Design a protein around this nucleic acid. Structure first.
Length: 97
DNA sequence: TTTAACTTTCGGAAATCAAATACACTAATATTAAAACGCGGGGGACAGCGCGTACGTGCGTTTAAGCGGTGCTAGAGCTGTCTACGACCAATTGAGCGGCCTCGGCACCATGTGACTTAT
């Protein structure tokens, strides 16, 4: 058995734990912190990737592309607050009317 | 063949339990600095306009941009190996403010000897 396996999360929480270790965020790394934040990250990735799926459906290209990613993330009004100053590579910009 | 997760522990952390302040607010109070009603105003900001203008709008001949070979070498990234350098321990200090003391100087009772005296 593995900690990354029993976590039931895609991203390996062991990697997150040791990243927190070398990241100097504190002297001890609470074992629930990496798994919790890994799950939060996985949900946010799920948001981006269900947007990817429906953008692939809308644009008829089965595999998601950065244009679709930029368009969907810029249409995500609440998420743009998190990613306001953020910008995406090769994504262009959403059309202004 | 190399990035992990078992573990096998343990000694600082992060809970707990507690009382010591102490601070916030919920609140009376007459005052009283600013609010907010209330009418003109200037002043200005927008309606409407002429015609000048300035950036597109449109052709000719250029120019660079883009490839497309032709090296070649400067670093990429990696050093395999020697320290240095800093993280730990501790000693190696120290200074500052209480502690004892201990200086010498007073007031007071003890002790011996020089008068002298007397009854030896």
């Amino acid at each position: 058995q593995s900690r990354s396996a029993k976590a039931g999360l895609t991203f390996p929480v062991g990697r997150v734990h040791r990243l927190l270790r070398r990241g100097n965020y504190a002297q001890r790394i609470g074992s629930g912190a990496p798994v919790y934040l890994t799950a939060v990250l996985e949900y946010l990735a799920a948001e981006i990737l269900e947007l990817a799926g429906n953008a692939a459906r809308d644009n008829k290209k089965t595999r998601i592309i950065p244009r679709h990613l930029q368009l969907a993330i810029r249409n995500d009004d609440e998420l743009n607050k998190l990613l306001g100053n953020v910008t995406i590579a090769q994504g262009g910009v959403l059309p202004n009317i």
